[PDB]
Amino acid sequence: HHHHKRKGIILAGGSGTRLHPATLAISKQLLPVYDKPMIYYPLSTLMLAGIREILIISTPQDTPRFQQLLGDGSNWGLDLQYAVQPSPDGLAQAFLIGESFIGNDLSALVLGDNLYYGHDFHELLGSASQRQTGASVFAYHVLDPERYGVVEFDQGGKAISLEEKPLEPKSNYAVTGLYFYDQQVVDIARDLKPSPRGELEITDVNRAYLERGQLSVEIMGRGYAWLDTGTHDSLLEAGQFIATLENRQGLKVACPEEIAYRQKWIDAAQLEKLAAPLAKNGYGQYLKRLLTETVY
Amino acid sequence: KRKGIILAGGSGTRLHPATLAISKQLLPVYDKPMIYYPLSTLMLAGIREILIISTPQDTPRFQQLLGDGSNWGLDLQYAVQPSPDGLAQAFLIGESFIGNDLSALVLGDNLYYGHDFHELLGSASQRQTGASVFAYHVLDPERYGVVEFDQGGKAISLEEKPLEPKSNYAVTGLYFYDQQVVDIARDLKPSPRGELEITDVNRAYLERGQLSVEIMGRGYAWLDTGTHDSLLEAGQFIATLENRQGLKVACPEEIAYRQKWIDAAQLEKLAAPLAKNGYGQYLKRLLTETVY
Amino acid sequence: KRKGIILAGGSGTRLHPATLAISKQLLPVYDKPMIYYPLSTLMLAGIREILIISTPQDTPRFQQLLGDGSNWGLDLQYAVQPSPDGLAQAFLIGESFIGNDLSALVLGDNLYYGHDFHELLGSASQRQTGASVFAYHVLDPERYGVVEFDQGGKAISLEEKPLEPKSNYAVTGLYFYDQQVVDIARDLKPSPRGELEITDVNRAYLERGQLSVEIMGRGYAWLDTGTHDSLLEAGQFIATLENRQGLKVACPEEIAYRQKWIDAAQLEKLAAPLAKNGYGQYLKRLLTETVY
Amino acid sequence: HHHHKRKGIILAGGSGTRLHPATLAISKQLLPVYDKPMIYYPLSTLMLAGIREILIISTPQDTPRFQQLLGDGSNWGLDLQYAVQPSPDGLAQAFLIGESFIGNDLSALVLGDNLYYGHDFHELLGSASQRQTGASVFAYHVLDPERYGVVEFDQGGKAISLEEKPLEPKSNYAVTGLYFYDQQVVDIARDLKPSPRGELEITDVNRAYLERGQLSVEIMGRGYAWLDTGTHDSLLEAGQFIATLENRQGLKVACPEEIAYRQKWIDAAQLEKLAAPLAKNGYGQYLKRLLTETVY
Ligand SMILES: CN(c1c(N)n(Cc2ccc(Br)cc2)c(=O)[nH]c1=O)S(=O)(=O)c1ccccc1
Ligand SMILES: CN(c1c(N)n(Cc2ccc(Br)cc2)c(=O)[nH]c1=O)S(=O)(=O)c1ccccc1
Ligand SMILES: CN(c1c(N)n(Cc2ccc(Br)cc2)c(=O)[nH]c1=O)S(=O)(=O)c1ccccc1
Ligand SMILES: CN(c1c(N)n(Cc2ccc(Br)cc2)c(=O)[nH]c1=O)S(=O)(=O)c1ccccc1
Ligand SMILES: [Cl-]
Ligand SMILES: [Cl-]
Ligand SMILES: [Cl-]
Ligand SMILES: [Cl-]
């Protein structure tokens, strides 16, 4: 039968019991990093990549809290839809849950607990999303590559293997929780078998693209900060890091209102209304300052 | 016998958007939910029957977190504050819970630390008549109830958020009352800023010579949770203590255990669901380590 | 009468390159030089005659920083440790300074904080015979002198950096001795790792039943300065206390002032050269504020 | 009479009494930021700009400590010379003190207490130093522009005024403590008169270049961190910021040995020797890892 843009997914489900009891009353991706909820950072990340149709995947328990926080996205020039993940059966599951949302479009997956910062981050995202076929991932040098998907490179910089949490990592380059995919991903994810843990592995997805000669791995250099939210200690460092940048600059990191404003998905009048309910705190005052300041 | 209340109500829009999705006192300070700290404080004071007051939206979540308390040897109840009309409203909402008993109120977002905290709370809770509060030296007393002392160290006035504070001594968020507080609370009128003021309660006792203001010395940490920057500093402070010591601040299960409100067997069971993380490992280690 | 020693000697190459240019105990923890903290500790213990031992390179700089002590009502002297041959060498270098008197040793990079620290030090310094030390629960006891206690709480062994620690109780860097320590130090032989061990001194008193090990409870902060990460945590801990309180930890001038070793007029003069910064402003405010 | 590259200056003199008593025993620029002395960061910054001949200006009291720390630079492929600043008479004084060092060459001034971090920092420095005439400065958005030299821009992005610590800043763009100059600077600095404070102002120097149509002002964007070392509080945040980046990555910020190595001012054998004396700590172990790791 005859036939004739990129959608975003934020996976913000269960971190199981790993951070209990801190996370007994709410999901991790609603905990604040400094002044804003965690999910603002990966959300702003998708927005920075130019993505406006976004699916937020969470637990059944917490979907209402995400919905209360973010609405349908139309205040920030977005359309946000919602899906639930009954059981934390792995990251690749986002594509089965997100199958009808994705449709026949390209996609991007971002972990709902991943924080990024740096210069020309916009352009780094822009190059990944412009690649219309294949998958694109980012490799970041870390102290503890054993905890991550690890990329092995040959002498000419070419990616030649991927291993999920190897005990003896071939390099210190970890695959970050930000992923760009073409229209082949749903089918790749549908045919995965659970790993020995009992999860549908994103690293198997990425390996399938690697075996087709269609995985781009770009370096996210050391001049970027890819922050750890894995532990209570790392969470605290993430808050301190953002607080230090924000107090130094009088500018915010991953303020979604700002990113919409600079993308011109919202205008001055719209942003002025969003500042009204928050006028008596620093966040609404910050939104108001953005209306009459040129920031390069 | 003394009953406890934790007022863990709404902090307006002051910390939005971080508190949009959920109330402050369910956010963590480092490894545990903020409310673990004031709950632990009441438990250290020997108080086992405790009323938790939160917004109507968040009461299910406090309930889900803490249950009826029986697993930690407590008897928890729950009640709602529909609107943030002032801290003294705790005694009106809590009137039937209190009954004819002595009471203590702690604010749901106040963190305490220090040597002999147990005996400081115990000397306040043993005082069967009158009211006991604590005064603590702060940088910014305008934000609090401010105690003025005469040259003999005797408290002579209390002012709520004065524009010109008389000293740097702030009343902490921890209050012990006798059987008169309910009746004093019932007679309160709203202040200029629309609230039933805990400070007017304390002023009623001060006017009868019945307010014991004890100094919480500079060797105690009373931590600030009122701003994003201070919520952060507190996490860092707790983390530095717990990583130095291999011991936890305000772990309710440990406090129950050392009060002997639960025995070894029950603590073992509590450590089971969390066995794979540090928090349950910590509980397990408490069974066979002597900590002075 | 009891004399003090601060051992502020070399920490090898362990923290290089940060300590290449200058010794650790002249680096700041937040607003003040590390040594202000242990010096303040000795002063809180009532000790006014104090010997500062540093490397030969850095003694001029300790001298330049602190002078003879007379401006703060102290009597400071100085001596050198040519090589880091162990903490017990303090008593050999310090032999003639000590004379026939009681002594206390504090390590130059140890930070203490807590309620009733004054009375904890005072009960140790009042014990005119034997030796008093403090045991503190830590995560990593292998790094320290480790106390083992029997079931009655009585100390029964000390091991320096054991591979298999018997408890989590570390001996802190703060030691009170009677008139026997010099003679015990003189008889020490170097350990396998080439040092005159403070732990062998304490073991000599333990074998005579003369070692008082008191618990420094979990409500005290004994902060770690041994790593870059811990030096940082300490700055953050001090900063959080001082910014919350508008009061300083281990300001020597305040301690002198409250001991009444200097009077109002002398404190005023001390606040003059620093008047344009917070540290001198702080000193000036101490003249006309009552702090309990 | 007939005639026929860029030198660096680090100003690391007195911060007066402002941080006393912390700075009573040593100068500020020898205090560590996390694991390394402060002066390593601006030094590495000059090295990143490709500058190998560098003059360190300090107090007479502390010149030996700087010399003990850094030597003559030949271990790191540099030549380091030393000068003293008897009295803290302003930043522009570096050019009178440095006059014979500079000679007839181009120059760069960096404050000895300035910390920078970000992606493509190398390329940002490269563009400033390639400009062979005029001066080049960097403008950075900050919360407290009143404390700094402030750049005013017109509607087309063009710099039109500079004011030193204005009470009512025309923008939030502060001039950073990193400056590139052509051969005119010594003469400009010689003819300055002290300000009402009694200092030779770097902002007057920069204004003189602006009045000649020869000041380039480039934006150092918000994706860079220009950290504050002005206060005990900011110092502590600077240490936390570096510690968080370093523990996350297993890579160092402004390790001078590394920068020399990557510039190829030193070779593998030379770097191996520099690791020998530090082998039992993390810093020497880090130098050793750099010998057999490819880091992009
Ligand atoms: C610091 N960054 C940042 C930047 N650069 N910007 C400016 C910006 C926003 C949108 C566009 Br279109 C181009 C520039 C912003 O408004 N908020 C930001 O957080 S970032 O590009 O590194 C970043 C963006 C989104 C999430 C996390 C980091
Ligand atoms: C550090 N403190 C503390 C202490 N002291 N203890 C020991 C202890 C617990 C219960 C009892 Br009856 C006696 C001693 C504990 O198990 N957990 C603690 O967090 S504390 O008394 O300052 C404290 C207790 C509760 C909440 C906040 C601080
Ligand atoms: C916070 N502490 C402290 C206290 N408590 N005081 C008050 C004080 C000082 C001297 C005396 Br005689 C009695 C009380 C002070 O002036 N400075 C302090 O730093 S402390 O006793 O825990 C302490 C003292 C000295 C070094 C480190 C901590
Ligand atoms: C994080 N940065 C950094 C980087 N990028 N590098 C890598 C690098 C070093 C030299 C060259 Br030629 C090209 C790349 C490094 O070895 N150490 C560094 O600190 S940086 O460019 O932002 C920087 C360099 C020097 C001082 C402060 C920051
Ligand atoms: Cl980079
Ligand atoms: Cl105290
Ligand atoms: Cl204690
Ligand atoms: Cl940028």
Short mmCIF file of C-alpha atoms in Angstrom, two decimals, chain B residues 9-287:
data_model
loop_
_atom_site.label_atom_id
_atom_site.label_comp_id
_atom_site.label_asym_id
_atom_site.label_seq_id
_atom_site.Cartn_x
_atom_site.Cartn_y
_atom_site.Cartn_z
CA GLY B 9 2.70 22.33 56.06
CA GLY B 10 3.12 24.40 52.90
CA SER B 11 5.93 26.94 52.32
CA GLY B 12 3.84 28.97 49.83
CA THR B 13 5.44 29.52 46.41
CA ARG B 14 8.76 30.66 48.00
CA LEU B 15 10.84 27.65 46.72
CA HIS B 16 8.95 27.05 43.42
CA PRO B 17 9.53 25.43 41.03
CA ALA B 18 11.49 22.95 43.21
CA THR B 19 8.49 22.47 45.52
CA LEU B 20 5.81 22.63 42.82
CA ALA B 21 5.52 18.84 42.48
CA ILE B 22 5.83 18.02 46.23
CA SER B 23 6.18 19.59 49.63
CA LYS B 24 9.54 20.54 51.03
CA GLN B 25 9.47 18.17 54.03
CA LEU B 26 9.36 15.10 51.72
CA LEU B 27 12.50 16.27 49.87
CA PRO B 28 15.70 14.75 51.13
CA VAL B 29 18.50 16.24 53.13
CA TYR B 30 21.30 13.99 51.83
CA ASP B 31 20.21 10.30 52.39
CA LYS B 32 16.83 10.78 54.05
CA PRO B 33 13.51 12.65 53.84
CA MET B 34 13.58 16.01 55.60
CA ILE B 35 10.89 14.89 58.06
CA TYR B 36 13.18 12.10 59.36
CA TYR B 37 15.13 14.81 61.15
CA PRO B 38 12.34 16.42 63.23
CA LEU B 39 10.67 13.04 63.80
CA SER B 40 13.99 11.77 65.11
CA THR B 41 14.12 14.86 67.30
CA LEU B 42 10.76 14.04 68.91
CA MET B 43 11.81 10.42 69.36
CA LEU B 44 15.08 11.51 71.07
CA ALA B 45 12.86 13.55 73.42
CA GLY B 46 11.13 10.28 74.43
CA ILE B 47 7.93 11.15 72.56
CA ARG B 48 6.21 8.16 70.92
CA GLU B 49 2.65 9.44 70.11
CA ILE B 50 2.98 11.97 67.33
CA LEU B 51 0.65 13.88 64.99
CA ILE B 52 1.84 14.80 61.52
CA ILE B 53 0.17 17.83 59.97
CA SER B 54 0.74 18.48 56.22
CA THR B 55 -1.17 20.07 53.34
CA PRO B 56 -4.26 18.16 52.17
CA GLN B 57 -2.51 17.16 48.95
CA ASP B 58 0.53 15.67 50.70
CA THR B 59 -0.97 13.81 53.71
CA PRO B 60 -1.29 10.54 51.72
CA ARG B 61 2.38 10.72 50.95
CA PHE B 62 3.45 11.30 54.59
CA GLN B 63 1.14 8.38 55.48
CA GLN B 64 2.63 6.18 52.80
CA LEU B 65 6.17 7.08 53.94
CA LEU B 66 5.70 6.62 57.68
CA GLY B 67 2.61 4.43 58.20
CA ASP B 68 1.05 4.22 61.66
CA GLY B 69 4.54 4.15 63.22
CA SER B 70 4.18 0.69 64.79
CA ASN B 71 7.26 -0.72 62.97
CA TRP B 72 9.42 1.85 64.75
CA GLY B 73 7.55 1.54 68.08
CA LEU B 74 5.55 4.77 67.52
CA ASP B 75 1.86 5.58 67.26
CA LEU B 76 1.49 8.09 64.39
CA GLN B 77 -1.66 9.96 63.42
CA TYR B 78 -2.24 12.48 60.68
CA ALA B 79 -4.10 15.71 60.17
CA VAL B 80 -4.34 18.47 57.58
CA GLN B 81 -3.75 22.22 57.50
CA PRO B 82 -5.96 23.46 54.60
CA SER B 83 -4.23 26.85 54.49
CA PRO B 84 -0.96 28.17 55.97
CA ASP B 85 -2.64 30.47 58.53
CA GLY B 86 0.27 30.28 61.03
CA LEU B 87 2.18 27.82 63.20
CA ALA B 88 -0.23 28.18 66.23
CA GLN B 89 -2.94 26.55 64.14
CA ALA B 90 -1.18 23.26 64.96
CA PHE B 91 -2.78 23.38 68.43
CA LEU B 92 -6.31 24.00 67.04
CA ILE B 93 -6.03 21.23 64.41
CA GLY B 94 -4.29 19.09 67.05
CA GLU B 95 -6.69 19.92 69.93
CA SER B 96 -8.36 16.47 70.25
CA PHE B 97 -5.07 14.59 69.61
CA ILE B 98 -3.46 16.59 72.47
CA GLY B 99 -6.39 15.96 74.85
CA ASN B 100 -5.41 16.67 78.46
CA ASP B 101 -1.68 15.93 77.96
CA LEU B 102 1.57 17.82 77.73
CA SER B 103 2.69 18.60 74.17
CA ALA B 104 5.68 19.36 71.96
CA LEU B 105 5.65 21.00 68.54
CA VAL B 106 8.56 20.71 66.09
CA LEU B 107 8.69 22.31 62.68
CA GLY B 108 8.89 19.76 59.89
CA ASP B 109 11.89 21.39 58.20
CA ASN B 110 14.17 22.05 61.22
CA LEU B 111 17.43 20.11 61.55
CA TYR B 112 19.30 19.85 64.85
CA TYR B 113 22.67 18.37 65.70
CA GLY B 114 24.92 18.26 68.78
CA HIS B 115 26.44 16.59 71.80
CA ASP B 116 24.00 15.93 74.66
CA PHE B 117 20.96 16.92 72.48
CA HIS B 118 19.15 14.07 74.29
CA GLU B 119 19.66 15.75 77.71
CA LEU B 120 18.82 19.18 76.38
CA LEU B 121 15.47 17.85 75.11
CA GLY B 122 14.98 15.72 78.24
CA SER B 123 15.37 18.66 80.66
CA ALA B 124 12.81 20.65 78.61
CA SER B 125 10.32 17.70 78.42
CA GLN B 126 10.65 16.97 82.20
CA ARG B 127 9.47 20.53 83.05
CA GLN B 128 5.79 19.61 83.67
CA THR B 129 4.45 23.19 84.01
CA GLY B 130 4.93 26.17 81.75
CA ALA B 131 6.58 26.28 78.34
CA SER B 132 10.18 25.71 77.24
CA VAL B 133 11.74 27.15 74.07
CA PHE B 134 15.29 27.47 72.74
CA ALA B 135 17.16 30.64 71.69
CA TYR B 136 20.06 30.30 69.23
CA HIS B 137 22.48 32.95 67.98
CA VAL B 138 21.93 33.66 64.25
CA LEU B 139 23.28 36.08 61.64
CA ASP B 140 19.80 37.20 60.52
CA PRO B 141 17.40 37.40 63.50
CA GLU B 142 14.72 39.51 61.51
CA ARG B 143 13.53 36.28 59.91
CA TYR B 144 12.51 34.72 63.24
CA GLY B 145 10.94 35.17 66.63
CA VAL B 146 13.51 37.27 68.46
CA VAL B 147 14.19 36.99 72.22
CA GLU B 148 15.43 40.04 74.18
CA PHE B 149 17.28 39.36 77.45
CA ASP B 150 18.05 41.76 80.35
CA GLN B 151 21.58 41.99 81.87
CA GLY B 152 20.91 39.02 84.20
CA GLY B 153 20.16 36.74 81.21
CA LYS B 154 16.40 36.83 81.83
CA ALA B 155 14.08 36.92 78.78
CA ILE B 156 11.98 40.13 78.73
CA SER B 157 10.43 40.38 75.23
CA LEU B 158 9.60 38.37 72.08
CA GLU B 159 9.03 40.00 68.71
CA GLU B 160 8.04 38.11 65.56
CA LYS B 161 10.16 39.24 62.59
CA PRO B 162 11.05 42.70 63.91
CA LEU B 163 12.50 45.26 61.46
CA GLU B 164 14.94 46.25 64.24
CA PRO B 165 15.80 43.07 66.22
CA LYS B 166 16.71 43.59 69.87
CA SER B 167 19.31 40.79 69.87
CA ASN B 168 20.68 38.10 67.56
CA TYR B 169 18.82 35.37 69.44
CA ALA B 170 16.18 33.53 67.38
CA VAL B 171 13.64 31.16 68.88
CA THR B 172 14.24 27.70 67.30
CA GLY B 173 11.39 25.61 65.77
CA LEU B 174 10.99 23.37 68.76
CA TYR B 175 8.43 23.99 71.50
CA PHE B 176 7.37 22.19 74.70
CA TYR B 177 4.07 23.21 76.29
CA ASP B 178 1.99 22.26 79.29
CA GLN B 179 -1.86 21.81 79.29
CA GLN B 180 -2.53 25.55 78.72
CA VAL B 181 -1.42 25.88 75.08
CA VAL B 182 -4.67 24.74 73.42
CA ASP B 183 -6.69 27.32 75.42
CA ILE B 184 -4.12 30.04 74.65
CA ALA B 185 -4.22 29.10 70.93
CA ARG B 186 -8.03 29.22 70.84
CA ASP B 187 -7.96 32.87 72.09
CA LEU B 188 -5.43 34.07 69.47
CA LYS B 189 -6.43 36.58 66.80
CA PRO B 190 -4.70 36.68 63.37
CA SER B 191 -1.67 39.03 63.26
CA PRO B 192 -1.40 41.98 60.80
CA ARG B 193 0.05 39.47 58.23
CA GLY B 194 -2.96 37.08 58.58
CA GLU B 195 -1.53 34.36 60.88
CA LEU B 196 -2.05 32.70 64.22
CA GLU B 197 1.46 33.37 65.59
CA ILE B 198 3.44 30.83 67.61
CA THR B 199 5.22 33.91 69.03
CA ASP B 200 1.91 35.18 70.60
CA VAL B 201 1.55 31.77 72.26
CA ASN B 202 5.08 32.13 73.72
CA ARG B 203 4.39 35.75 74.69
CA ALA B 204 1.30 34.54 76.69
CA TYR B 205 3.58 32.29 78.74
CA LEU B 206 6.28 34.98 79.06
CA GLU B 207 3.65 37.46 80.51
CA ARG B 208 2.75 34.82 83.20
CA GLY B 209 6.49 34.32 84.03
CA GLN B 210 6.06 30.83 82.61
CA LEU B 211 8.40 30.85 79.57
CA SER B 212 11.68 29.04 80.07
CA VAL B 213 14.02 30.33 77.33
CA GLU B 214 17.11 28.10 77.33
CA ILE B 215 20.14 28.93 75.19
CA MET B 216 20.93 26.41 72.52
CA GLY B 217 24.65 27.11 72.50
CA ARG B 218 26.95 27.71 69.54
CA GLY B 219 28.16 24.09 69.80
CA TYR B 220 24.80 22.96 68.43
CA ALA B 221 24.03 23.12 64.77
CA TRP B 222 20.48 24.39 64.11
CA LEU B 223 20.40 24.27 60.27
CA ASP B 224 18.62 26.60 57.91
CA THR B 225 16.21 25.01 55.40
CA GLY B 226 14.50 28.24 54.26
CA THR B 227 16.37 28.77 50.93
CA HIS B 228 17.78 26.69 48.06
CA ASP B 229 21.30 27.64 49.19
CA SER B 230 20.64 26.67 52.79
CA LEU B 231 18.87 23.32 51.83
CA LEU B 232 22.10 22.57 50.01
CA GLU B 233 24.48 23.55 52.87
CA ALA B 234 22.45 21.21 55.15
CA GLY B 235 22.91 18.22 52.86
CA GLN B 236 26.63 18.95 52.76
CA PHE B 237 26.76 19.28 56.56
CA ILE B 238 24.97 16.02 57.16
CA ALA B 239 27.09 14.25 54.50
CA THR B 240 30.36 15.41 56.00
CA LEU B 241 29.26 14.11 59.47
CA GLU B 242 28.04 10.73 58.27
CA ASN B 243 31.05 10.05 55.97
CA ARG B 244 33.56 10.99 58.66
CA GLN B 245 31.87 8.89 61.36
CA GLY B 246 30.29 5.89 59.61
CA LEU B 247 27.30 6.87 61.80
CA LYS B 248 24.00 8.54 60.77
CA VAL B 249 22.29 11.67 61.99
CA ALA B 250 18.53 11.25 62.64
CA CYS B 251 17.99 7.68 61.49
CA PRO B 252 14.55 7.01 63.13
CA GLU B 253 15.16 3.25 63.31
CA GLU B 254 18.36 3.70 65.29
CA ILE B 255 16.60 6.07 67.68
CA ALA B 256 13.76 3.63 68.22
CA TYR B 257 16.36 0.91 68.73
CA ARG B 258 18.39 2.81 71.35
CA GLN B 259 15.23 3.90 73.19
CA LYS B 260 14.43 0.14 73.22
CA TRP B 261 11.06 0.80 71.61
CA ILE B 262 12.04 -1.97 69.16
CA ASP B 263 14.28 -4.99 69.87
CA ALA B 264 17.08 -6.65 67.87
CA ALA B 265 14.72 -8.94 65.95
CA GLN B 266 12.50 -6.07 64.69
CA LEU B 267 15.52 -3.96 63.65
CA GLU B 268 16.82 -6.99 61.68
CA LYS B 269 13.53 -7.17 59.78
CA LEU B 270 13.63 -3.41 59.09
CA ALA B 271 17.11 -3.81 57.55
CA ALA B 272 15.90 -6.50 55.07
CA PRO B 273 14.07 -4.50 52.34
CA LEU B 274 16.96 -2.02 52.14
CA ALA B 275 19.79 -4.70 52.41
CA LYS B 276 21.27 -3.90 48.95
CA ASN B 277 21.90 -0.19 49.77
CA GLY B 278 23.95 1.61 52.44
CA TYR B 279 20.91 2.53 54.52
CA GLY B 280 19.91 -1.12 55.21
CA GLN B 281 23.57 -2.13 55.56
CA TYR B 282 23.80 0.58 58.23
CA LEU B 283 20.82 -0.84 60.07
CA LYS B 284 22.27 -4.38 59.95
CA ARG B 285 25.64 -3.16 61.34
CA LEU B 286 23.80 -1.54 64.32
CA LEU B 287 22.79 -5.07 65.57
#
